Amino acid sequence: TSQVRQNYHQDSEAAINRQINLELYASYVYLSMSYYFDRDDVALKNFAKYFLHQSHEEREHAEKLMKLQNQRGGRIFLQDIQKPDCDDWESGLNAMECALHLEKNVNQSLLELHKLATDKNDPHLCDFIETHYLNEQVKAIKELGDHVTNLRKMGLMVGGLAEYLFDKHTLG
Amino acid sequence: TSQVRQNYHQDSEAAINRQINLELYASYVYLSMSYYFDRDDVALKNFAKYFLHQSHEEREHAEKLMKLQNQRGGRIFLQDIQKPDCDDWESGLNAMECALHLEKNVNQSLLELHKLATDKNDPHLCDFIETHYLNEQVKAIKELGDHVTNLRKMGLMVGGLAEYLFDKHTLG
Amino acid sequence: TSQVRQNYHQDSEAAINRQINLELYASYVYLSMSYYFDRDDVALKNFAKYFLHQSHEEREHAEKLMKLQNQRGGRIFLQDIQKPDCDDWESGLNAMECALHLEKNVNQSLLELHKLATDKNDPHLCDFIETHYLNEQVKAIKELGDHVTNLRKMGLMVGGLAEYLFDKHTLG
Amino acid sequence: TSQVRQNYHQDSEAAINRQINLELYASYVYLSMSYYFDRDDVALKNFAKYFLHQSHEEREHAEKLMKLQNQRGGRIFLQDIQKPDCDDWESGLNAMECALHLEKNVNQSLLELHKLATDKNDPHLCDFIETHYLNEQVKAIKELGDHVTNLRKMGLMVGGLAEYLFDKHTLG
Amino acid sequence: TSQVRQNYHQDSEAAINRQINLELYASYVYLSMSYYFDRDDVALKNFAKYFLHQSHEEREHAEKLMKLQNQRGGRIFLQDIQKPDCDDWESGLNAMECALHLEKNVNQSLLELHKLATDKNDPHLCDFIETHYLNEQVKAIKELGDHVTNLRKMGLMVGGLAEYLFDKHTLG
Amino acid sequence: TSQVRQNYHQDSEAAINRQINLELYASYVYLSMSYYFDRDDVALKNFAKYFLHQSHEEREHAEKLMKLQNQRGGRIFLQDIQKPDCDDWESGLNAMECALHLEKNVNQSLLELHKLATDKNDPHLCDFIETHYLNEQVKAIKELGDHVTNLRKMGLMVGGLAEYLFDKHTLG
């Protein structure tokens, strides 16, 4: 037992650990995507700029959770990071409709973090999850949804220009 | 009965009261449109920025009329602000033409307002209407007209890309 | 059903739409008061200024709610905004006791809305309601209580003079 | 006994400990008034501001004594700080006459202190109270004097209106 | 009755008055500690600066609670400030352990406060408690914790060199 | 095969990929250490500041490697990151003896990478490895060794204080 721990459940410490692993997997996924778009066979610089920046703040999301662990007196237990499923993300829209599938999955996983803390009656943990993660995660989910409908809407016929112009104008 | 009233007809009042309702109607529909393009399945952030700007300045057209009514001694009697008969504005061209149909409607009611004032023979109010509304509205209509024909020239095949580029370059 | 939607109940969707009608209604009411004090037979420019400022950011409250909806994947369904129950607000004390009575009622809407979200397990809507409206709303009822109470204490019937000075010194 | 203690009587050591409780008492009482006018049924923002600054200063008189205690080698012995005899201060005039009554009681206590030190042969302790406390305390008591007289003179049955204006022009 | 009160239980009003006493209690013990370290036989300047600063922000925590009672229509009933049970805090880490023991006590008092408010279904008071107090209190407890361990890992033989160096490098 | 590729062997394609995994491992190892030192049972602000900085730049090092693969026409194949064997890094000296052990291993894998490029006769890859890594590696092993001998030397007896002062003076 720690010297700082106070109303911090046995279950909720083990829980945010998993969440730590989650958003690291996700930043890993993001740089796997971002260095795919800098390939000489896709060459969409601003896409890469976009997915790398998304990756860099999911590592920030991960670190901020790691502080909260230390702040509440719990103890961090690192776990391995699994490689993203895809190694080649096909198109530029598949990448965006696949990123949307991912942060919708962490948001899922973020809501169960909340309702666990809502039921082991940890008000602090719940304020932390509302302010720092939940509206950021919805605002993100909104940004990726806009991107896919804007891409799909230029579908198709010219298409390869569609994603080109999209890269230069919407991520530039 | 009033201290300030002087040559302010019993029905140039009833008309200005009505004209106020119209400009509140137009501001409502513009908010209806502006948050329609703010949808994740429509996702044209500059169309939204555009109609939201019209929603404000038609509203400040409306409160500029309320000012004037108090100024001549007639008294505002507000009415209900009916709902836009549309919920789904389908596309970006439909929105602009259906908007253009509206500004022709406020201009035709503003022109009737002028003549009612030329026939209850109030020199002052007609300068007020031509100064603040008429050239404002023909400016408006020509600006609505150009946009409409440009979206049309980007017609037929393609199209969804059309709406996009117009969003980036004519509303940026 | 929309791409972004995740943990957004059809009951919290209808509820915010009812709540948007509320805040547009309220701003309309403040607008009706604001040009009431612009009359030459009441003539309190700073009462006019004050309620006009209140009108301008229940509209900013209404948009913040409409945008919040697009963000969670719901769709907006606008309704008519009805006329305020009064055309003549009688006094400056009467005006502020009807304002206080109004934001006490918008509050029960905000509180039932918050308890509608607390028992459909949507933590995000609650923080949005907690952060952006709930304390914003009791800072208003408190201010309205202050102003109601100052007008009542001095009044007695030193007469209208009470009201003039209040305009100059607390509302200037 | 300290290495620093030198010509510091055990009788004037206990007396300054008694004097610390007093100024902490007065600060608590001034704080108790300060939020009295923060109530919505009293609503004098600047009465609240005024007494809030006064509590912020006798409590800063209090550490000036506790610092002085360690400087002369004595040892502080803290006691409880008592609930003010009054929870509802009735008036703005009533407030300013218990405020005057208290600083007169703090003074009698400061003057009794100065004669304990001039007669236990402490030249230093007397300048300390002369320089830092005595004339500040008469400039308070005189100013508690004006305000009471100003409130009384105009309180002549115009009533609550007298109080509002005093808040704005003498405490602004 | 009170003309702002809206969804504020008399039991949640009884509780904050209770809580107001605590942080006035907390500030009182900090003033007892910091002026203990201002003694010529303990003489740790930055320790004295530290608890004096804590004594302030708890007194600022406390008077912010009083503002919340008035905005909601519940009325402050001040109580006595009982004296800290310690007079000689012995040591530099005895004083810190004993503080860490205290802020866990206020943090437990605020968590009971937060959940009595979750039971009388007060959405507003909970956002006030988590945003203004809980994360404040866990930031504090973790800060009391690091210092406690660092003063310990400098323990055993030498020591006091410990207190001195820690005063100079971690609190300077 | 790739449009850009020229004098880039399939053995060095697999080789750089492997090396990528390594330094993300080291990057993983470094955060894991740094949030060990932010614990209330270690409480060394600046050790964390230092290990978090190193974890932040082995990932900079790793992304630099991934850009070069895209630069030369090979294709990145990411794999999983194994958790550091340690979860608790013991002392601050053990931690730096263990970091020194870590970068001395990647240097050895980094020079093995270099001698594969001089034997598959690829000048550019060796320049890339010479300029960007190999001296950065020695400047790194030199600094960790400096820290280790400063820590050993100094805490030969009365320790913990040793490690405390080292945190404040060499990592500030």
Side-chain angles (χ1 to χ4, degrees), chain E residues 75-122:
Chain E
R75 266 41 198 148
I76 292 154
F77 290 115
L78 291 189
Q79 232 61 54
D80 298 303
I81 312 269
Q82 74 242 16
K83 155 217 62 158
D85 53 326
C86 180
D87 313 66
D88 210 291
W89 299 94
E90 278 182 339
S91 170
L93 151 73
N94 171 89
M96 288 276 234
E97 292 182 280
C98 201
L100 165 84
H101 185 32
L102 168 150
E103 309 260 42
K104 276 167 132 161
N105 266 35
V106 309
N107 179 42
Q108 193 120 355
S109 302
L110 276 95
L111 291 202
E112 315 210 300
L113 190 39
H114 180 286
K115 277 295 140 148
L116 178 77
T118 279
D119 171 27
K120 313 306 185 232
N121 237 3
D122 216 12

Short mmCIF file of all heavy atoms in Angstrom, two decimals, chain E residues 75-122:
data_model
loop_
_atom_site.label_atom_id
_atom_site.label_comp_id
_atom_site.label_asym_id
_atom_site.label_seq_id
_atom_site.Cartn_x
_atom_site.Cartn_y
_atom_site.Cartn_z
N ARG E 75 -27.34 30.16 3.57
CA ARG E 75 -26.79 31.27 4.36
C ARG E 75 -25.71 30.79 5.33
O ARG E 75 -25.91 29.81 6.06
CB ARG E 75 -27.93 32.01 5.08
CG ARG E 75 -28.48 33.27 4.30
CD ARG E 75 -28.61 33.03 2.77
NE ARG E 75 -28.72 34.18 1.85
CZ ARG E 75 -28.23 34.15 0.61
NH1 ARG E 75 -27.61 33.05 0.19
NH2 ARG E 75 -28.32 35.18 -0.22
N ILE E 76 -24.58 31.51 5.34
CA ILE E 76 -23.41 31.18 6.15
C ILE E 76 -23.73 31.32 7.63
O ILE E 76 -24.27 32.35 8.06
CB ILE E 76 -22.25 32.13 5.77
CG1 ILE E 76 -21.74 31.87 4.35
CG2 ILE E 76 -21.09 32.07 6.77
CD1 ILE E 76 -21.09 33.08 3.68
N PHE E 77 -23.34 30.31 8.41
CA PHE E 77 -23.43 30.32 9.87
C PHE E 77 -22.03 29.96 10.34
O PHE E 77 -21.68 28.77 10.43
CB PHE E 77 -24.47 29.33 10.41
CG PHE E 77 -25.91 29.72 10.14
CD1 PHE E 77 -26.70 28.93 9.32
CD2 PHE E 77 -26.47 30.85 10.71
CE1 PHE E 77 -28.03 29.26 9.06
CE2 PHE E 77 -27.80 31.19 10.45
CZ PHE E 77 -28.58 30.39 9.62
N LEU E 78 -21.24 30.96 10.69
CA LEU E 78 -19.87 30.71 11.09
C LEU E 78 -19.82 30.00 12.43
O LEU E 78 -20.74 30.08 13.24
CB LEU E 78 -19.10 32.02 11.19
CG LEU E 78 -18.83 32.75 9.89
CD1 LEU E 78 -17.89 33.86 10.21
CD2 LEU E 78 -18.19 31.80 8.94
N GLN E 79 -18.74 29.24 12.64
CA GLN E 79 -18.49 28.55 13.90
C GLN E 79 -17.08 28.88 14.37
O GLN E 79 -16.33 29.61 13.70
CB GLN E 79 -18.68 27.03 13.78
CG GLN E 79 -19.63 26.42 14.83
CD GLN E 79 -21.05 26.98 14.76
OE1 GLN E 79 -21.69 26.96 13.70
NE2 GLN E 79 -21.54 27.52 15.89
N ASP E 80 -16.74 28.36 15.55
CA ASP E 80 -15.44 28.61 16.15
C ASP E 80 -14.32 27.97 15.34
O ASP E 80 -14.53 27.05 14.55
CB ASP E 80 -15.42 28.09 17.59
CG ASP E 80 -16.43 28.78 18.48
OD1 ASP E 80 -16.37 30.02 18.58
OD2 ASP E 80 -17.30 28.09 19.06
N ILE E 81 -13.12 28.50 15.50
CA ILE E 81 -11.93 27.95 14.87
C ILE E 81 -11.16 27.25 15.98
O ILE E 81 -10.37 27.88 16.68
CB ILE E 81 -11.08 29.03 14.21
CG1 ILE E 81 -11.91 29.98 13.35
CG2 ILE E 81 -10.05 28.40 13.34
CD1 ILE E 81 -12.05 29.60 11.93
N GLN E 82 -11.36 25.95 16.15
CA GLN E 82 -10.68 25.27 17.25
C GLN E 82 -9.16 25.30 17.04
O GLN E 82 -8.66 25.34 15.91
CB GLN E 82 -11.19 23.83 17.43
CG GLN E 82 -10.77 22.79 16.38
CD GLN E 82 -11.95 22.18 15.59
OE1 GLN E 82 -13.05 22.74 15.61
NE2 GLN E 82 -11.72 21.04 14.90
N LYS E 83 -8.43 25.30 18.14
CA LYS E 83 -6.99 25.49 18.10
C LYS E 83 -6.30 24.20 17.65
O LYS E 83 -6.75 23.10 18.01
CB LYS E 83 -6.49 25.94 19.48
CG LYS E 83 -5.03 25.62 19.81
CD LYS E 83 -4.90 25.24 21.28
CE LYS E 83 -5.71 23.97 21.61
NZ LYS E 83 -5.23 23.25 22.83
N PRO E 84 -5.24 24.29 16.85
CA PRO E 84 -4.48 23.09 16.49
C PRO E 84 -4.00 22.35 17.73
O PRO E 84 -3.52 22.96 18.69
CB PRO E 84 -3.29 23.63 15.69
CG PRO E 84 -3.71 24.96 15.21
CD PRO E 84 -4.69 25.51 16.23
N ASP E 85 -4.10 21.02 17.68
CA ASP E 85 -3.79 20.19 18.84
C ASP E 85 -2.30 20.12 19.15
O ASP E 85 -1.93 19.62 20.22
CB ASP E 85 -4.37 18.78 18.66
CG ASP E 85 -3.96 18.13 17.35
OD1 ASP E 85 -3.81 18.85 16.35
OD2 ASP E 85 -3.80 16.89 17.33
N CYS E 86 -1.45 20.65 18.28
CA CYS E 86 -0.01 20.64 18.47
C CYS E 86 0.52 22.05 18.67
O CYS E 86 0.06 22.99 18.02
CB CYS E 86 0.69 20.00 17.27
SG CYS E 86 2.48 19.95 17.43
N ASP E 87 1.50 22.20 19.56
CA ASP E 87 2.18 23.48 19.71
C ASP E 87 3.62 23.48 19.20
O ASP E 87 4.06 24.46 18.62
CB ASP E 87 2.19 23.89 21.19
CG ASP E 87 0.81 23.76 21.84
OD1 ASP E 87 0.34 22.60 21.96
OD2 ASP E 87 0.22 24.79 22.22
N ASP E 88 4.33 22.36 19.32
CA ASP E 88 5.73 22.26 18.94
C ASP E 88 5.77 21.17 17.89
O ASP E 88 5.65 19.99 18.22
CB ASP E 88 6.59 21.89 20.17
CG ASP E 88 8.01 22.43 20.11
OD1 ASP E 88 8.81 21.95 19.27
OD2 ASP E 88 8.35 23.32 20.93
N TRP E 89 5.98 21.54 16.63
CA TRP E 89 5.87 20.52 15.60
C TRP E 89 7.15 19.72 15.48
O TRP E 89 7.34 19.02 14.48
CB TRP E 89 5.48 21.12 14.25
CG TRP E 89 4.16 21.80 14.27
CD1 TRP E 89 3.93 23.12 14.48
CD2 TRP E 89 2.87 21.19 14.10
NE1 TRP E 89 2.58 23.39 14.46
CE2 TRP E 89 1.91 22.22 14.23
CE3 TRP E 89 2.44 19.89 13.86
CZ2 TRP E 89 0.54 21.98 14.12
CZ3 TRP E 89 1.08 19.65 13.76
CH2 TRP E 89 0.15 20.69 13.88
N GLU E 90 8.03 19.83 16.48
CA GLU E 90 9.24 19.03 16.62
C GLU E 90 10.20 19.25 15.47
O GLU E 90 11.28 19.83 15.62
CB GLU E 90 8.90 17.54 16.71
CG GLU E 90 8.46 17.02 18.08
CD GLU E 90 8.20 15.52 18.07
OE1 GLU E 90 7.97 14.96 16.98
OE2 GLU E 90 8.22 14.90 19.15
N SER E 91 9.79 18.79 14.29
CA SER E 91 10.73 18.58 13.21
C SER E 91 10.17 19.08 11.90
O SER E 91 8.98 19.40 11.75
CB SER E 91 11.08 17.11 13.07
OG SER E 91 11.81 16.94 11.88
N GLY E 92 11.05 19.05 10.91
CA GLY E 92 10.66 19.42 9.57
C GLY E 92 9.96 18.31 8.85
O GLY E 92 9.15 18.59 7.96
N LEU E 93 10.22 17.05 9.17
CA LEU E 93 9.29 16.19 8.48
C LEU E 93 8.14 15.75 9.36
O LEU E 93 7.11 15.35 8.82
CB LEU E 93 9.96 14.99 7.79
CG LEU E 93 9.29 13.64 7.54
CD1 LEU E 93 8.36 14.08 6.40
CD2 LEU E 93 10.21 12.41 7.14
N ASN E 94 8.25 15.88 10.69
CA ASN E 94 7.05 15.66 11.50
C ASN E 94 5.96 16.61 11.05
O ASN E 94 4.81 16.20 10.85
CB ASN E 94 7.35 15.87 13.00
CG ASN E 94 6.07 15.86 13.90
OD1 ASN E 94 5.63 14.81 14.38
ND2 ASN E 94 5.49 17.05 14.12
N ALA E 95 6.33 17.86 10.79
CA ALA E 95 5.38 18.87 10.35
C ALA E 95 4.77 18.53 9.00
O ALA E 95 3.63 18.91 8.74
CB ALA E 95 6.02 20.25 10.31
N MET E 96 5.56 17.94 8.10
CA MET E 96 5.04 17.57 6.78
C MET E 96 4.17 16.31 6.81
O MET E 96 3.10 16.28 6.17
CB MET E 96 6.19 17.41 5.80
CG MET E 96 6.82 18.71 5.42
SD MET E 96 5.96 19.55 4.09
CE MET E 96 7.33 19.80 2.96
N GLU E 97 4.62 15.24 7.51
CA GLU E 97 3.75 14.08 7.74
C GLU E 97 2.45 14.51 8.36
O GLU E 97 1.41 13.88 8.12
CB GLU E 97 4.38 13.07 8.70
CG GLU E 97 5.57 12.35 8.22
CD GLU E 97 6.04 11.35 9.24
OE1 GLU E 97 6.72 11.76 10.22
OE2 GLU E 97 5.73 10.16 9.08
N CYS E 98 2.50 15.54 9.19
CA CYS E 98 1.34 15.83 10.00
C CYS E 98 0.38 16.66 9.16
O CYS E 98 -0.85 16.56 9.28
CB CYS E 98 1.85 16.50 11.29
SG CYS E 98 0.82 16.53 12.80
N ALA E 99 0.95 17.39 8.18
CA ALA E 99 0.17 18.06 7.15
C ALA E 99 -0.43 17.06 6.19
O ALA E 99 -1.61 17.13 5.89
CB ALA E 99 1.01 19.07 6.36
N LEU E 100 0.38 16.10 5.72
CA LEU E 100 -0.15 15.08 4.83
C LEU E 100 -1.32 14.36 5.50
O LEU E 100 -2.30 13.99 4.84
CB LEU E 100 0.97 14.10 4.46
CG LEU E 100 0.61 12.76 3.82
CD1 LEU E 100 0.42 12.86 2.30
CD2 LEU E 100 1.69 11.76 4.19
N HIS E 101 -1.21 14.16 6.81
CA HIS E 101 -2.34 13.63 7.55
C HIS E 101 -3.54 14.56 7.50
O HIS E 101 -4.68 14.10 7.54
CB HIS E 101 -1.94 13.38 8.99
CG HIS E 101 -3.01 12.72 9.80
ND1 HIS E 101 -3.91 11.83 9.25
CD2 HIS E 101 -3.32 12.81 11.12
CE1 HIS E 101 -4.73 11.40 10.19
NE2 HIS E 101 -4.39 11.98 11.33
N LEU E 102 -3.31 15.87 7.39
CA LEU E 102 -4.43 16.81 7.42
C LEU E 102 -5.13 16.91 6.07
O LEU E 102 -6.37 16.95 6.01
CB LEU E 102 -3.97 18.20 7.88
CG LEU E 102 -5.00 19.32 7.67
CD1 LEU E 102 -4.85 20.42 8.72
CD2 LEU E 102 -4.91 19.92 6.26
N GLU E 103 -4.38 17.00 4.97
CA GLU E 103 -5.01 17.20 3.68
C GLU E 103 -5.70 15.95 3.16
O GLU E 103 -6.65 16.07 2.38
CB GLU E 103 -3.99 17.70 2.66
CG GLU E 103 -3.19 18.90 3.16
CD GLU E 103 -3.70 20.25 2.61
OE1 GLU E 103 -4.94 20.45 2.54
OE2 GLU E 103 -2.86 21.11 2.25
N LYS E 104 -5.30 14.77 3.65
CA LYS E 104 -6.10 13.56 3.47
C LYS E 104 -7.39 13.64 4.26
O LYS E 104 -8.38 13.00 3.89
CB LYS E 104 -5.31 12.33 3.90
CG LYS E 104 -4.41 11.82 2.81
CD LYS E 104 -3.44 10.84 3.37
CE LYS E 104 -3.38 9.59 2.52
NZ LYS E 104 -2.10 8.89 2.85
N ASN E 105 -7.39 14.42 5.35
CA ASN E 105 -8.60 14.60 6.14
C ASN E 105 -9.56 15.55 5.43
O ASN E 105 -10.75 15.25 5.31
CB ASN E 105 -8.26 15.14 7.54
CG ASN E 105 -8.11 14.03 8.60
OD1 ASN E 105 -7.64 12.92 8.33
ND2 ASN E 105 -8.52 14.35 9.83
N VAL E 106 -9.05 16.66 4.87
CA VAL E 106 -9.93 17.52 4.10
C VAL E 106 -10.33 16.85 2.80
O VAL E 106 -11.49 16.93 2.38
CB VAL E 106 -9.31 18.91 3.84
CG1 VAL E 106 -8.80 19.54 5.12
CG2 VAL E 106 -8.24 18.85 2.79
N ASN E 107 -9.42 16.11 2.19
CA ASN E 107 -9.81 15.42 0.96
C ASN E 107 -10.88 14.37 1.23
O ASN E 107 -11.72 14.11 0.36
CB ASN E 107 -8.62 14.78 0.28
CG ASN E 107 -9.01 14.06 -0.96
OD1 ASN E 107 -9.82 14.56 -1.75
ND2 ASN E 107 -8.49 12.85 -1.14
N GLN E 108 -10.86 13.75 2.41
CA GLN E 108 -11.95 12.84 2.74
C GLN E 108 -13.22 13.59 3.07
O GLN E 108 -14.31 13.09 2.81
CB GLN E 108 -11.59 11.92 3.90
CG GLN E 108 -12.57 10.75 4.08
CD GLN E 108 -11.89 9.39 3.94
OE1 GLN E 108 -10.70 9.31 3.62
NE2 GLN E 108 -12.66 8.32 4.16
N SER E 109 -13.09 14.80 3.63
CA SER E 109 -14.27 15.61 3.92
C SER E 109 -14.88 16.17 2.66
O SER E 109 -16.11 16.31 2.57
CB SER E 109 -13.91 16.77 4.86
OG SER E 109 -13.33 16.31 6.07
N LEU E 110 -14.07 16.43 1.64
CA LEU E 110 -14.64 16.90 0.39
C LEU E 110 -15.27 15.76 -0.40
O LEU E 110 -16.27 15.97 -1.09
CB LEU E 110 -13.60 17.65 -0.43
CG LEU E 110 -13.70 19.06 0.18
CD1 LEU E 110 -12.69 19.36 1.29
CD2 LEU E 110 -13.78 20.17 -0.87
N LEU E 111 -14.74 14.55 -0.27
CA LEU E 111 -15.35 13.43 -0.98
C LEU E 111 -16.71 13.09 -0.39
O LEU E 111 -17.65 12.79 -1.14
CB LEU E 111 -14.42 12.23 -0.98
CG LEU E 111 -13.15 12.39 -1.83
CD1 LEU E 111 -12.60 11.03 -2.20
CD2 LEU E 111 -13.43 13.22 -3.07
N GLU E 112 -16.85 13.15 0.94
CA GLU E 112 -18.18 13.00 1.53
C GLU E 112 -19.08 14.13 1.09
O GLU E 112 -20.27 13.94 0.80
CB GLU E 112 -18.12 13.00 3.05
CG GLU E 112 -17.05 12.16 3.65
CD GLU E 112 -17.45 11.63 4.99
OE1 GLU E 112 -17.73 12.46 5.90
OE2 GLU E 112 -17.51 10.39 5.14
N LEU E 113 -18.52 15.33 1.01
CA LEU E 113 -19.29 16.45 0.51
C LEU E 113 -19.75 16.19 -0.91
O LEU E 113 -20.94 16.33 -1.23
CB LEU E 113 -18.46 17.72 0.62
CG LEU E 113 -19.23 19.00 0.35
CD1 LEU E 113 -20.61 18.87 0.98
CD2 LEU E 113 -18.46 20.17 0.94
N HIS E 114 -18.85 15.69 -1.76
CA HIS E 114 -19.22 15.47 -3.15
C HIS E 114 -20.30 14.41 -3.29
O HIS E 114 -21.03 14.40 -4.29
CB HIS E 114 -18.02 15.08 -4.03
CG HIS E 114 -18.41 14.85 -5.46
ND1 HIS E 114 -19.10 13.73 -5.87
CD2 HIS E 114 -18.31 15.65 -6.55
CE1 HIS E 114 -19.37 13.83 -7.16
NE2 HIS E 114 -18.90 14.99 -7.59
N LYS E 115 -20.41 13.49 -2.34
CA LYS E 115 -21.37 12.42 -2.57
C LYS E 115 -22.68 12.63 -1.84
O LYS E 115 -23.71 12.13 -2.31
CB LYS E 115 -20.76 11.06 -2.23
CG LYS E 115 -19.90 10.47 -3.41
CD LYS E 115 -20.76 10.16 -4.68
CE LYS E 115 -20.07 10.52 -6.01
NZ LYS E 115 -20.39 9.66 -7.21
N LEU E 116 -22.69 13.38 -0.74
CA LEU E 116 -23.96 13.90 -0.23
C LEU E 116 -24.65 14.73 -1.28
O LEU E 116 -25.89 14.75 -1.34
CB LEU E 116 -23.75 14.73 1.04
CG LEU E 116 -25.04 15.36 1.61
CD1 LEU E 116 -25.91 14.35 2.37
CD2 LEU E 116 -24.76 16.60 2.47
N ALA E 117 -23.88 15.41 -2.13
CA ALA E 117 -24.42 16.23 -3.21
C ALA E 117 -24.86 15.39 -4.39
O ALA E 117 -25.74 15.81 -5.14
CB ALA E 117 -23.39 17.25 -3.67
N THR E 118 -24.22 14.23 -4.59
CA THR E 118 -24.68 13.26 -5.59
C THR E 118 -25.98 12.57 -5.16
O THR E 118 -26.73 12.05 -6.00
CB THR E 118 -23.57 12.25 -5.88
OG1 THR E 118 -22.63 12.83 -6.79
CG2 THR E 118 -24.12 10.95 -6.44
N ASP E 119 -26.32 12.65 -3.87
CA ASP E 119 -27.50 11.99 -3.35
C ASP E 119 -28.67 12.96 -3.29
O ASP E 119 -29.77 12.63 -3.75
CB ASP E 119 -27.20 11.44 -1.96
CG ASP E 119 -28.44 10.93 -1.24
OD1 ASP E 119 -29.42 10.52 -1.91
OD2 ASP E 119 -28.44 10.96 0.02
N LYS E 120 -28.44 14.19 -2.85
CA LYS E 120 -29.42 15.25 -3.02
C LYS E 120 -29.41 15.82 -4.43
O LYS E 120 -29.92 16.92 -4.64
CB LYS E 120 -29.18 16.36 -2.00
CG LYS E 120 -28.96 15.85 -0.60
CD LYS E 120 -30.12 14.96 -0.20
CE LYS E 120 -29.99 14.53 1.23
NZ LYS E 120 -30.08 13.07 1.37
N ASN E 121 -28.82 15.09 -5.38
CA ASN E 121 -28.91 15.35 -6.82
C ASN E 121 -28.73 16.83 -7.11
O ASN E 121 -29.64 17.53 -7.55
CB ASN E 121 -30.21 14.81 -7.40
CG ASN E 121 -29.96 13.83 -8.53
OD1 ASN E 121 -28.81 13.51 -8.84
ND2 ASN E 121 -31.03 13.35 -9.15
N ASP E 122 -27.53 17.30 -6.83
CA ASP E 122 -27.08 18.67 -7.07
C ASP E 122 -26.00 18.63 -8.13
O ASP E 122 -24.81 18.55 -7.80
CB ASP E 122 -26.52 19.28 -5.78
CG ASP E 122 -26.83 20.78 -5.62
OD1 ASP E 122 -27.66 21.32 -6.36
OD2 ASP E 122 -26.20 21.42 -4.75
#
